[PDB]
Design a protein around this ligand. Structure first.
Ligand code: EQO
Ligand code: EQO
Lengths: 221, 19, 221, 19
């Protein structure tokens, strides 16, 4: 528990310093491309691409703050981040869902409704992502739990092409105990909350597997 | 230009670790 | 015939000065977004938007060079141009079709294959426009005939909301005579060429009617 | 921003006749 307490602290902090809370942000909206669903709006896609790229970098930063991550080979670090980054992006944006307005909020405060999220880049996966966001709400996750869940998703010894899968498994072990203990101590009345949280990684995977193979359009630089 | 999302993500990450 | 000769000359020149011949252009290609069809490529759409806007302005300029056009009210001029501009754009790009490479060439020389044209902005109408381009080939149209057909399509007394529909009809009459006489003189061996050409306006309308209704995305702007 | 092609075409032409 002293070493478990300090792990939870390190992971909570890693998440918080790389992902602002909704309450810490100045939410702002736009009327751009709200009228109907279209294949893509170029202005929203430009912003969405920019914000997504920034969040990928912030997720890399998050990973580097996780105990032991930078002791892995650079090859294994990149391999883990390739495999889990989109899953973590999906979890992150879904934690900024506001059910009353059916909106999601990016890390600069930009706040878009469902149709705008469709036109910004969710496209045919829009309702899937929003269903996932809604299914998160009953869990009532805090920063520590979001961060530990992200960490468990990332630090996975079963990713193909790992050079040192045993070492990765070693790093995952304490994160699992950390989440298990934390969830138990946070809500002792609800004993299935731990496995329910873990199984959300499967839902993330259903979406990211579809998303990763989509051919996207970008500027030629 | 066209690229799979997976290949784009891989590029962003790889470039970030570059020395 | 001299009054007819004068009109054909004026209309040929109007077209030529607002629309370069394929042979007058430096054709250049690109490998951008050639791999597969996608809903939109942002680089190609940016270029396509830019080029189309310029061609709209050049088509306006073309109209102003047609005898009598600027004697119509500004309202009627705008009404005629709103109704026919896309039809003229379609005919124009299709006259720059190269059958051996299955490409179209814009007025700066940009030369794109069928997949690239799809991704630039043709979208679900790509095959329809290319079928029309291919159907033009047997007609073997020259500049005077392309210009006269454009003029006939534009100067139409049956457009909704014309203030002086009689005066528009008056301007169209000599264009019809001009095309009829010119086509007859050019190919005395092929007597149905005139009505065959005229009926191509119907085909332009099938395409433009679908195109006009499309919700497009633009920079704000 | 979204706009029908017809409305965009109308906008380009109307602005060109502006004086
Ligand atoms: C799988 C799907 C539907 C398909 C495609 C996506 C994409 C992408 C992309 C495009 C360009 C470059 C890199 C990636 C995508 C992205 C995300 C989450 C994004 C995100 C953005 C900002 C923040 C923030 O500011 O806090 C948090 C999360 C969720 C689902 C998708
Ligand atoms: C009906 C369809 C398939 C759907 C949509 C279109 C569009 C558009 C748009 C987009 C932004 C601004 C204005 C218009 C469009 C455009 C054209 C012909 C275009 C043109 C471009 C350049 C040149 C030149 O350089 O010589 C000649 C012809 C044909 C079919 C379409």
């Amino acid at each position: 528990t002293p070493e478990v307490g300090e792990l939870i602290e390190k992971v909570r902090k890693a998440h918080q310093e790389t992902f602002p809370a909704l309450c810490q942000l100045g939410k702002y909206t736009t009327n751009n491309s709200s009228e109907q669903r279209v294949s893509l709006d170029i202005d929203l896609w430009d912003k969405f691409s920019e914000l997504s790229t920034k969040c990928i970098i912030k997720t890399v930063e998050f990973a580097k703050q996780l105990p032991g991550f930078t002791t892995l080979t650079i090859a294994d670090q990149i391999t883990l981040l390739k495999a889990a980054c989109l899953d973590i992006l999906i979890l992150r944006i879904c934690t900024r869902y506001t059910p009353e307005q059916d909106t999601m909020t990016f890390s600069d405060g930009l706040t878009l409704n469902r149709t705008q999220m469709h036109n910004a880049g969710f496209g045919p996966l829009t309702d899937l992502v929003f269903a996932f966001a809604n299914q998160l709400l009953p869990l009532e996750m805090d920063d520590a739990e979001t961060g530990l869940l992200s960490a468990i998703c990332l630090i996975c010894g079963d990713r193909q092409d790992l050079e040192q899968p045993d070492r990765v498994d070693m790093l995952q072990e304490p994160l699992l105990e950390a989440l298990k203990v934390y969830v138990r101590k946070r809500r002792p009345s609800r004993p299935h909350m731990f496995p329910k949280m873990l199984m959300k990684i499967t839902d993330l995977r259903s979406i990211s597997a579809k998303g990763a193979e989509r051919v996207i359009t970008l500027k030629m630089e | 230009r066209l690229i799979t999302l997976a290949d784009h993500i891989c590029q962003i990450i790889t470039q970030d670790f570059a020395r």
